[PDB]
């Protein structure tokens, strides 16, 4: 779930993906990438070979196991936009997220299935198409309910 790479110097790094990414769907966080290199010198230039110092190098190969970030337990995080209904005519279909089946009255509160159903005797905004997962799970859910 991580991408490793060398970036230019700075205090704010953006990260983007455009391969199906939303016009290159990107974010931008702050990250004080300042080159605190060893020795008196202050540049990224190996070529006149005089420098032989220790360096804390990032590993360039893939891992075997070093320490586990924990991904599991596919939850949701609060929304309002799961299912469809005109207040006693509810349509619940297959979905891209694990959508709980909620209504304003009756047994519609939950149920993370992608199963088609009509719903009466409930709420027009009261359809709680919930978030969940099955065979999924984020790391810690930082924004992430």
């Amino acid at each position, epitope marked *: 779930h991580f991408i490793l790479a060398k970036c230019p110097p700075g205090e704010r790094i953006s990260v983007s993906f455009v391969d199906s990414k939303n016009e290159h769907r990107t974010c931008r966080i702050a990250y004080h990438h300042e080159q605190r290199l060893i020795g008196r010198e202050r540049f990224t230039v190996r070529p006149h070979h005089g420098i032989e110092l220790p360096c804390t190098t990032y590993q360039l190969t893939t891992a075997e196991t070093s320490e586990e970030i924990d991904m599991h337990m596919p939850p949701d995080i609060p929304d309002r936009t799961i299912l*469809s209904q005109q*207040s006693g005519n509810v*349509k619940i279909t297959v979905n891209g997220r694990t959508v709980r089946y909620s209504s304003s009255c009756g047994s519609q509160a939950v149920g993370t299935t992608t199963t088609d159903k009509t719903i009466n005797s409930c*709420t*027009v905004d009261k359809c709680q198409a919930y978030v969940t997962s099955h065979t999924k799970w984020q790391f810690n859910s930082p924004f992430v309910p």
Partner: antibody
Amino acid sequence: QIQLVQSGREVKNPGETVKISCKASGYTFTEYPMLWVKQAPGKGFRWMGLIYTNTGEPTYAEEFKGRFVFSLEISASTAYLQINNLTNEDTATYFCVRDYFISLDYWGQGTTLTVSS
Amino acid sequence: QAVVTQESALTTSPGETVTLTCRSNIGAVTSSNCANWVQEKPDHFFTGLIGDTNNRRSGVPARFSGSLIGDKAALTITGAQTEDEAIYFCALWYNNLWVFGGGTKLTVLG
């Protein structure tokens, strides 16, 4: 569903709001939410909006937006599909309906208004 | 979001039925969409003869029933009795309104 009684034949001056009244009782007034009618005869199925308001989503339509604004004391399904900024072109049925059986299954009696300044 | 333009008379005879399909502009009228086709009456008629896109909706007789019919909310008026004249609204759903247009001239003879 929504047992809707409609408003009267309204008489509306120019620029005002003409609430097509609704006694949308017999069921939940949220169970039969604010399904507005703004139906002319040339319109047929005329825009006033739809709402089953059991969760609370009543909307004015394209015909219930601009000139329309859906309001109600909807506890007994008391409703006013208001011709808001209703000019001399305010003659239309501000009509009752309720969202249940996902179109206007429970329906109203209609409130046909003659708008004229 | 389509103004339901369709067969101009989606109506039948006395003992006769007319199965038209009034185009709400995306396709068939739906059930979670709530689009339909049915003879409702005039006079600010909050009553769906056929809504919910598989049969008659709430507030009308079920025989002038909604469908996903043709390219529209289908007004399959089977059971055109003596009182079968109305606005056969064939329109499409959006999950908030079965949007009809000017109405098919719904007829049951008699």
